[PDB]
Structures are given as structure tokens and as C-alpha cells.
Design a protein around this nucleic acid. Structure first.
Ligand SMILES: [Mn+2]
Ligand SMILES: [Mn+2]
Ligand SMILES: [Mn+2]
Ligand SMILES: [Mn+2]
Lengths: 708, 708
DNA sequence: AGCCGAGC
DNA sequence: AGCCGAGC
């Protein structure tokens, strides 16, 4: 047939074609899973063809894009479809190589999306097929204990095995699935107008605001359901297209927003935050390959997605070039990106290395980990719902992402101006308004109207024939500007003639210098109409969508950055008081420990008590009878949810020495003074300390950056 | 010109061609190193072209092989050479695009080989060029401290930086090398007949026995030089072809034998032994990717070669299929190899995993590490010169390799027969002769003549038209036998008609079953001439080259396997006595430690001495005045090349408890009995224990293998 | 029409 | 002519 990736059914194309079924699979591993599952006998009436991933959404797309899509035309050639052809009469059905399409995808949310996009593909082009049951699906187990399909179905029921993707199952597992197809085959049925309303709702861009009300109801419904304790509704026989969209594909759309939309608190996404927790737990003193780090992230943080997406998430975190990250939390050791190509020049993740920027732990203090809520995957603690930075990192690095029904876009903001605003709010003032600021950007950003800005590069007049461009607007890439601006100016086009005579390129990897030559008359005309407008050095910047998950996990739209700063400030200052309440408990339990350690050793050295020959049961009963507290640190640590004196009795015999008692009393007096000192500090004083240490290293790091 | 990998000189092909120089580089990284080193000005008269690696040796090669070699014809097209063309007259030189070839390679031994193979290439085809200085080389530093070329030159002279390959140097380092070319350019000069004698000596297969006397002199010369303390002679102006071959290329040939030829002791090569030391130090409880393990091997063991060769060395160690490893020291978790294709079906090293076979530490006991000599790379201890297995592993896994002037080939041998022979020699008997035995090989191996054997598969007569092949001779691969034997029998050839009517394939991944159909008359003729001869199921096995490095590091040829077994036995039994001498010292120092720990604690509990308030200087002076020994373990450990009582004074205060003194006296009496017990054992008794434990796990592992 | 990025 | 493997 000409498609190498396809294994065609033996009866496909013959007189039995209508009884044949084409199996569309997610990944080539599922293809091999389905091929061995059918075996010799199944190879007759069942074809199997892979899909590379998420397919084209053909409801709204350009005609050229549809005709140029390799996958869409492969499915058309395999099944024998024809565009605009309605299938009713027996004469029309004779032109079909297959009678059914059975979609086989993973049981995660991304599989349901591919399911929906294939439903969206058939519903648009041939509704004659969709009404009559042309589409089926083959479900697999997500978990076993003896088979369970959806994770809510397994939790309500409660050797256990979790199935990640279709490639996890292999060998006799595939053959067992195809032995009984009554359980694993579910047919899509067309109920009526409710179905068409659901399909178009998901996959049409006219429905965006409807999808907002769609997911807003689901989020509030589940949250209220989670409050009242009602169980999570699950699926998995016939399945209507309406029920699939509303009870299944919605789970992908919500999960898409959760991963793609950052949190207001730390300005992170679940993927990124899992990366930083891993780096935080590894605490590497030397660089590690991005590929190896990605593998370690997946093991430690329970990251269930592909390795390619995770490595680019790491690379995205490490890019320091102009227009990307005002503060890069990962060091870019090796070549991560060029301002030239806008990060697309990144070297392969195997050949580049990274590690924590020294500012990472300063922005995310270690002690604040005790105040977080760490999540769990299959009894494995992984990473918190959020970290709590000393400043609103969501504003610094310009968090952005695209979900379903919502999108988030933020520009960057200067770290020092934010720290100053936090200091202003700590002294009781109102915060100053903030314009977007990009690190090492020599151009200008000025406010046009509400949430609209004008970003402009730099261009000068050297002489009558010459102009010099030393800057491009933020996110405008050197190479791109050369190809789509100066080269059309130099070579001219069909409609527009050549404006400029020549140009040269002086660029530095981190800088932009263009020297353009023009005629005297044409330069005068250029600066008459203005230089920035002619040479396209102004780009509008408007964010009217700022969408973040607040500290309650609820999706909220923020009209001004000052709202994000204020809401962050109340939470962060509240957690600073929690840190003082935690520290005085920890430092207090440590001081009691040093007191009881000192009291015991001072009585044994003075001869008040002799531990010699005392039995374990006798000594432990005597130690508690003499008034010694039991391990105040572990007692206070366990209280956050037989007596243990071991901390006293595991001390070295060196302790009784003259210098070991003297250094222990000094340790005892120093910790009590430490508790007294920190108890007299306000939570705002702790915040100012963290800010002062951050700016000290920020000045050191950024000055070392410029010198290099 | 049509070669994409080439950067041509601007003046190449013009009237200045004779002044141009073609730079042949080792690797594309050296290509980029040389391109940036020349810069804009150097791009005129200097071309640069990469070489993939070791090139063809054209002195003895087939005409088709020479004409089909892409690299050789690329250099010919680039330089403008013509075969058989002698270059003397000015009319002939006008046809050359370049006047010189400057070879740029790493300063390691492998670079010198590429240098020599290029010298061997020009010397053979165009001696008219070689006599007149057509060839030059560009040397780089191997180390700096301020520049040193050969490692013996740096050690005799003695921030230090070691340069591994040409890719280590970068940026201004490349430009510094090409600023001064008087130091870094050396011209090859033809002295006379000594040169031709040296070139042919290295690269001709008629000279093999001459290369043996060549390297035998060098090995004995350096060893005698190493004994008398004379310094190692080094190179690095003009260099004669004779001096290059004898004073440089010989260093590659000796290093080639050292890596490619196994040691008699552990049956390992430096590459393999570095792998096993790493796995031994990591002590992984779970599997690790072969790619990741290879990276860890390189870091820990200081492995300076490419990662691809190391991963296949790991895969070679893990293959359990028929005809490979009687005992695989690494587990083959994932798909390492098929008997079908003979290991060439191995999956990519990134997708497969391995770990230590449970028999690994049983064959290489951990305690014997204390008896080895560990080497050092730049102050980093890495791995011993050899391990010392309980049985001659060189015989079990059939060590083999190809060096320069020598080659080693050994078949496998049954582990149990070897253990029995060792047990026979331990009881004072003579060892039984041993035929090669391959694990799970159902065929027969019988002795023909001295060091010559007949390996035969299995074929039966089912009926008049049918024969059944259940086995193929060792190393004969299923797929290969199908293509080159049965298929020519079935389809016939031009000269030979079709012998067999049909065949079928019942194979199991670990087994071979062929059912062949023939005419009644043609089967009778087949078994008349014999079935094994007709169907090619007999392959001769002769090893007359068994070449191993003995425990002195000297190359020796062994005529019989019994010599290898005897020489191993004397060394291994000698080291078993060393283990007893080491154990009684360690167990003795441990018993003294438990005695002085008990004496101190028993006097403090009885009240004989009070440590309370005693100053550090006062107590330490008192402890030594009362007769307590100082850390017998660390004193005995340091003796193998202020007083420390810390082991006594770091004891927990729990020690003074009634059950902690009782368990300490029991520890004291148990260690003294342990010393008394092991002191009454003979070194042969320790060996028999290690053998008995090995066979117990070997029976368990191999039985679990068959059940799986 | 195309970028932005976490996903298949 | 080609395998075996530690190397480029
Ligand atoms: Mn999936
Ligand atoms: Mn960003
Ligand atoms: Mn090298
Ligand atoms: Mn082998």
C-alpha cells in the first residue's frame, strides 16, 4: 500500500472489507502490543496502524494544512475514505477498505485526547459514519490487584501493579486482552444533538468561552464533591459521544490546565517543580548531564511523562540569554541557548550539563520545606504542592503556558524592584506600580494602556548614509530579524522595492549590532516616518490573560500584577510567621536536649549518679524517675502529626572529659541565647534577612556574569 | 568538490597548489579544532579533512577493497593523486591540488597508528612523494604545567592539566597552537633503506614473526630499563620514518597487546577489569542502564577510551547465550543477544540494564582485594593489575583478543571440571586433561590432535524423506546457518544443484530445531557420505596460539591448557596463604581491640578508674600509663606500608549497661575463638570452602536458569 | 500565519 | 573472504 509503518489486514480491500477493523494505536510500542495480541488468526480481519501522537484538529484548520498532513492522508488511504463522501447506500460502502476504526490508546488523560481528536476527525468530515457506530475503542487496565481501569475505580474498591502507558503490558498480557474482547471493546454510539454539542464544544475555537464555563463547573463540582466526601465518578458496553466528552475528555482538559498553568505562589508548573525538588534533594556539588538529571528526576519525583519533554523543561529553566529568565535557577553549563535563534540552538541534552544556581536555595530557603505539604504517588512522597519563595518568582521569570479553555502569559519583572516593593509593604506602605523589565535589555518598555506596553529596541543615526541598530525588542531574535526584516529590505520584494543598500553584522552571542547603509534621500524619508516604525523595532506587549492557581488550587484571573504581588505577600508573610513558630519549637526542643544532656553528664562527672552495671530496664526506669525528659526533638517531631533516652546514652565517653564538658556547656548556653535572640525577632525581620542575603549574592553573581 | 565533510583550501587547485597543505585530522572535533585554529587567514593555503578512524592498510588488501574504500578515494580526489603515478617532473606535479599532507592526530598511541597507516598509505602507492617530504605532522600537548608532549617527558621533568584527545583543547588553545608552528610542525624525512624496512615491518603480514621479535626486544628492553632505573626514552624539527616506527608506533603496538591480550590470572583485559572493579565498588542492589554504567565506569576507573567500545565490552561480559560465556559475570537484564544472530541482535545500550551475577563476588572474593595491587591514574587509585579468582576464569569464558604481532584464542571449559581438577591438585594428585566444554551445548567436541578439536552438532534420521537437526556446532549461528547452508541446499546454486526439497523452523531463542525434507534417493546418498559432512555440522577447532600475560606482566605462549591451570594454581594457592596471613592479622587486631575495650569498660564498671572530669591530655597520658594499646586495627593497618584511644572513648554510654557489657564479653570471647578456629585451618581448607560455596550457588543459579 | 511550552 | 573484539 506504500505506508511502511502499517500492518494491513489480510481481508482488507476484499469482499469482506466491511467486517475488517483498523486499529489506531498511540505509539509504536502499542502497535507491537496489538500485533502480538492478535497473533496469526487476528492478522486476517484486523489492521493496525500507529499514530505519532496528538493528531491534527481538522474542524478549524487551513485547507493547505489538512492536505499537507501525512497522518490524515495515511488514514484516508488505509481506510479508503474520500472527502465530502457520505456513506449510506451499499454502492458507496463498496469503496471502503475497512468497516470500523478501533482506537487503542493509553488509559491516561492524553490517550483520551487522541480518542477525542479522532472522534473530532470523523465527526467533521463524515458524519454519515459517526452516527452508525463506525468508531470503537479498545480499553486497557491502568492498574491490577483483579483488573481495574480508571484510578478512581481502584481507589473506591480499596500484589498491585500500576500500568504506565500501553508499552508496560507485554507478552501474555497482550494476548490475554485480545482473548476476551467483550470487556475490552466499547462502541461509540450517537445519541443525538447532545453529542454534536459536546464534540464541537471541546474541539472548536468558537467555544473557548463555553469551555471556560465548562471547566469552571467541573472544578467547582469536584471541589464541592471533595468537600462533602462524595466519591469521584468514573467510567469503565456502549459509550455515547456526549458522555465521553463530559465524563472523560474533560479529565484531560483539567489535567492539561493543571500542568500547563503555573501557580501564583512559586510561579511553577508540576513538571518544573518536580525538577527543582529533585535538584534540591540531590544537592549536587558538581554539574550533571541534563539527560542523566532528567532520569533522576523521573525516579525521585514520580514524573510519568516522556523524557524529551522533561529535558526541555530543564533546558527552559537554565536559559540565561536576553528575553528568557531574569533569574535562571539552573546553571547553563554547556550550550543551552543563543539569543540569536531564541533558544532553538540548544545542544542535545546528553552533551550539556547543569546544576543549581547559588541563588536557588536563597530564593527557596531550606528551612521553609518544613512548612510545605509534600504530595504522594503510590506511597512515595515526592514534591510539595508549591514552594514558597521569598519573592514572587511568578513575576520574575514571566511564567506562561497554554491549557484548554485558558492561557497564561506574564512578562518578566526586575528582581530588585520587586524586593524593594516587598520591603515597602513590610514597612507599611503601598507598592509602587511595576513595568515589565527584562534583564540586560537595553531597549525601552513603556506603558500604553491598561495591561498594554510598547517594547522598543535601539537604533541611531551615525551619518547621512548610515544607521546603527544596537538593540532588538524583547523576544525578537537576531537571526529571525535578519531573515524577515533586513534581508527583505535589502533584496526587496514583489510589492515593496529595496529600502536599504547594504548591512553588516558585528553581533556578539549575547548582543546585537547592525550597521545599515541607505541612500541619503531614503534615510531622510525613513526618519521622517520614524526609524523604529520603518525598521520594525517596536512590538506591542499586552497581557490581558494572567491566569494562576492560587494557594487554594483554584484557577483565578488577575487583572493587575499588583494583585499578584499583594496576594503573594499575604501568603508569604503568613508563612514567615509559621517559620518562626516552627523554629522556636525546633530550637526550643534542641535547647532542652542540650540541657538534659548537660544535666546528666554533670551529675555523672560530679558523682551524683553512677551508670556502671545498671541494667537497661533498671537504668531507663531510674532515668525517668530522676526527671530527665525523653528525646525532646523526636517527641516534638512526632507530635506534629517506650521512653527514648538514647540521645543521652549514645554520647561518647569523651563527653566526660574536661574539654568536652566545657564545650558542651558552651553549646548549652549558646543555644539558649539563640532561642532568646530569634524569639525577639519579628517575622518581617526574618524576611528582611532573607532578602538582604539574596541581593548580596545576586549582586555578586550578576557582577561575575558581566565580567565573564 | 562533492565531499561535504571537507573544508577546501582557497588556493587549492590553483597555480599555488604546491604550496598548499591538506590537514588530515582524527575525528571531526579535531577538524573543528583545526578550522578555528587557522581562522580567516589560514583558510587560504590550508585545507582540512576529517578521518573517521583507523584507515585502510593498503599494503596487503584486495583490489576491490581498495577501490571500494570511501576515505582512500576521498583523499585521492582532494589531493589530486593518481594511482601508479610517480611524481618527479614539473609536468607531473601540475596535477596535484596540494603539495603536502599534514596529519593531525591525538598524542595517544592510537593517533600514532593513524599516522603510521597514512605513512603506510603513501609509501606503498607513491614512494616518489614520500622520499621528498610530502608528509608532515602537527603535534599537540598531552599535558601542561609550560607545555609537555609525551607523558615520559613530563614525568622526567617533574596548575597541571591533562589533555585527552584533540577535542579537549578549544578556543584560544587552538589559535595558540597555530600562532607558533615552528614547535608544532615536524616533517617526516626519508633517511634510506632503514625507513622502508621499518614501514613494511609494521604494516605487512609477511613480517608478523619479525614483529614478534620486534616487540619481544622492546618488552625485555623496557623491563630491564625499568629494573636498572634508567629513564624512559621519549620523542618530541625533523623525524625520520625509521625513528617514528621504532620509537613511536611501537608504543601503540605494545599498548595494543596490553589491552587486547588477557592476563592468565583473572582472564581479563584492562577494559573488562576496569568494568568489574567499578561494579564491585558500586555494589548495585538493582539494575542500571549499560549506558549509565559505562559513564560511571569511565569516571571511577579512569577509562580514557570511547564510550561505545566500553558499552560493548559490558554487553560482551553479560551474554549468556550458547557459545559465549559459561559464566556471565554480569546479568543480562534486557535483551543483550540472540544465539540466532550471535550477539549482533543486541539492543541499544541505553535500553538494556545489567548488574552483578551473584556468582561474581563468589568467584572474586571481597577479602582478596586486600591482597591485590591497585594502580593509580593521576593520583586516583582505580583498579588492580589483576584480580585473583578461585578458579582460572581465563579458561571458563574462553578469553580471546587480537593485538599486534600476537593473538590469543581460547575455547571455554566447564566450571565444575575445573573445580574438580583444582580439588584434585589440592589433594596432591595430577590434574585430568580437559576438552573444551561449552555450557548448554548438546553437540560433541572430541580431540583430533594436539590442540585440535572437532565440534559437531546433532542431526537425526526421522524417516526416509526427513532429517532433524537439533544442534549446530559451537559459534555457528542459527540465522547464518540458514542463509549460507540450508538455503543454498534448497534453492541450489550455479555449480551445485538443489540437494533438499524443503525445510521448516521450530527454533526457540535458546535452541535450534531444523526439519529438512529430501528425496529418498538423495537422503541415502547423504548419509552414505555422512550427514554431518553433507549438512556442514562439523567445524574444526584449533588453538595453537594461547598467549597470556603471566603474573609478572610478561607475554608468554602456553602450549597446553594444563600449563595455564598449573601456573594459575601455584599463584592462587600462594595468595590463599597470603589471605590467611592477612586474616589472622586483621582478626588478631580486632580481638586485641575487643580485649582493650572490655578491659577499660570492666574497670570503669568495677570502679577501678573514673573518667569523670579527667582532662584530654591528662586522660590520654593516664590511659597509656595504665597499659592500654592504641587502636590495634589502625596501627596494624598503617603498619602495612599521638596515640589514638578514640575507639575506646567513642563508645556509647550504653556500653556500661548490664546487657551491653554482657554482649561485649560475648563479642570478646567469640572473636578469640574465631582467631583460634581460622588459625587451625590450612590455606587449602580456605580454598575448598570458597569452591564449595561457589558450586552451591552455581547449582542454584543454573537450575533457576533452566526453570526460567 | 506563527510563536510560546508541556505534552503525545 | 570473513569472524572474533577492543580500539579509532
Ligand atoms: Mn500515556
Ligand atoms: Mn519564560
Ligand atoms: Mn585519542
Ligand atoms: Mn568470549
Amino acid at each position: 500500500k506504500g505506508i511502511p509503518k502499517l500492518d494491513d489486514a489480510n481481508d482488507a480491500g476484499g469482499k469482506h472489507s466491511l467486517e475488517c477493523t483498523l486499529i489506531l494505536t498511540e505509539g509504536d510500542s502499542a502497535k507491537s502490543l496489538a500485533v502480538s495480541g492478535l497473533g496469526v488468526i487476528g492478522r486476517d480481519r484486523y489492521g493496525v496502524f500507529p499514530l505519532r501522537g496528538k493528531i491534527l484538529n481538522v474542524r478549524e484548520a487551513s485547507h493547505k494544512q489538512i492536505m499537507e498532513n501525512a497522518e490524515i492522508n495515511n488514514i484516508i488511504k488505509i481506510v479508503g475514505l474520500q472527502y465530502k463522501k457520505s456513506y449510506d447506500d451499499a454502492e458507496s460502502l463498496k469503496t471502503l477498505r475497512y468497516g470500523k476504526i478501533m482506537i487503542m490508546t493509553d488509559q491516561d488523560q492524553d490517550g483520551s485526547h487522541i480518542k477525542g481528536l479522532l472522534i473530532n476527525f470523523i465527526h467533521h468530515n463524515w458524519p454519515s459514519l459517526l452516527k452508525h457506530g463506525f468508531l470503537e475503542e479498545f480499553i486497557t487496565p491502568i492498574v491490577k490487584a483483579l483488573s481495574f481501569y480508571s484510578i478512581p475505580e481502584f481507589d473506591e474498591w480499596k500484589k498491585i501493579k500500576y500500568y504506565k502507558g500501553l508499552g508496560t503490558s507485554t507478552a501474555k498480557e497482550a494476548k490475554e486482552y485480545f482473548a476476551d474482547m467483550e470487556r475490552h471493546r466499547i462502541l461509540f454510539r450517537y445519541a443525538g444533538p447532545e453529542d454534536d454539542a459536546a464534540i464541537t464544544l471541546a474541539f472548536s475555537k468558537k467555544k473557548i468561552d463555553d469551555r471556560k464555563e465548562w471547566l469552571t463547573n467541573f472544578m467547582e463540582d469536584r471541589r464541592q464533591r471533595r468537600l462533602h466526601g462524595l466519591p469521584e465518578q468514573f467510567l469503565y458496553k456502549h459509550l455515547t459521544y456526549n458522555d465521553f466528552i463530559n465524563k472523560e475528555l474533560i479529565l484531560f482538559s483539567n489535567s492539561d490546565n493543571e500542568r500547563s498553568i503555573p501557580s501564583l505562589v512559586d510561579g511553577f508548573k508540576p513538571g518544573q517543580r518536580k525538577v527543582l525538588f529533585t535538584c534540591f534533594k540531590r544537592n549536587d556539588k558538581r554539574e550533571v548531564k541534563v539527560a542523566q538529571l532528567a532520569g533522576s528526576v523521573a525516579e525521585m519525583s514520580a514524573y510519568h511523562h516522556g523524557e524529551q519533554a522533561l529535558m526541555m523543561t530543564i533546558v527552559n529553566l537554565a536559559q540565561n540569554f536576553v528575553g528568557s529568565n531574569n533569574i535562571n535557577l539552573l546553571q547553563p553549563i554547556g550550550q543551552f541557548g543563543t539569543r540569536l535563534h531564541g533558544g532553538k540552538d540548544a545542544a542535545s541534552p546528553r552533551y550539556i550539563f547543569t546544576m543549581l544556581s547559588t541563588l536557588a536555595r536563597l530564593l527557596f530557603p531550606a528551612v521553609d520545606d518544613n512548612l510545605l505539604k509534600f504530595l504522594y504517588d503510590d506511597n512515595q512522597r515526592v514534591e510539595p504542592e508549591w514552594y514558597i519563595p521569598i519573592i514572587p518568582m511568578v513575576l520574575i521569570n514571566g511564567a506562561e503556558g497554554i491549557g484548554t479553555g485558558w492561557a497564561c502569559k506574564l512578562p518578566n519583572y526586575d528582581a530588585r524592584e520587586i524586593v524593594n516593593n516587598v520591603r515597602r509593604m513590610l514597612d507599611g506602605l503601598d507598592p509602587h506600580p511595576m513595568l515589565p523589565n527584562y534583564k540586560n535589555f537595553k531597549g525601552t518598555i513603556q506603558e500604553l494602556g491598561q495591561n498594554q506596553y510598547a517594547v522598543s529596541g535601539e537604533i541611531f543615526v551615525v551619518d547621512r548614509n548610515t544607521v546603527e541598530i544596537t538593540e532588538l525588542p524583547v523576544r525578537t531574535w537576531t537571526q529571525v530579524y535578519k531573515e524577515q526584516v533586513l534581508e527583505p529590505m535589502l533584496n526587496g520584494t514583489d510589492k515593496t522595492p529595496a529600502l536599504i543598500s547594504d548591512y553588516k553584522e558585528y553581533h556578539t552571542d549575547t548582543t546585537v549590532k547592525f550597521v545599515v547603509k541607505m541612500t541619503e534621500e531614503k534615510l531622510a524619508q525613513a526618519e521622517a516616518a520614524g526609524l523604529h516604525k520603518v525598521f520594525k523595532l517596536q512590538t506591542t506587549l499586552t497581557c490581558n490573560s494572567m491566569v494562576l492557581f492560587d494557594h487554594m488550587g483554584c484557577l483565578k484571573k488577575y487583572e493587575t500584577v499588583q494583585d499578584i504581588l499583594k496576594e503573594f505577600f499575604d501568603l508569604r508573610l503568613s508563612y514567615y510567621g509559621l517559620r518562626k513558630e516552627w523554629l522556636v519549637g525546633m530550637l526550643g526542643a534542641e535547647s532542652t536536649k542540650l540541657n538534659n544532656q548537660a544535666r546528666f553528664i554533670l551529675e555523672k562527672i560530679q558523682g551524683k549518679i553512677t551508670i556502671e552495671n545498671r541494667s537497661k530496664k533498671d537504668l531507663i526506669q531510674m532515668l525517668v524517675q530522676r526527671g530527665y525528659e525523653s528525646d525532646p526533638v523526636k517527641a516534638w517531631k512526632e507530635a506534629q502529626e517506650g521512653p527514648d533516652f538514647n540521645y543521652i546514652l549514645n554520647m561518647s565517653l569523651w563527653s566526660l572529659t574536661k574539654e568536652k564538658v566545657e564545650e558542651l556547656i558552651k553549646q548549652r548556653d549558646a543555644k539558649g541565647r539563640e532561642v532568646n535572640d530569634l524569639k525577639r525577632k519579628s517575622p518581617s525581620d526574618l524576611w528582611k534577612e532573607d532578602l538582604a542575603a539574596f541581593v548580596e549574592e545576586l549582586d555578586k553573581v550578576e557582577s561575575q556574569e558581566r565580567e565573564d
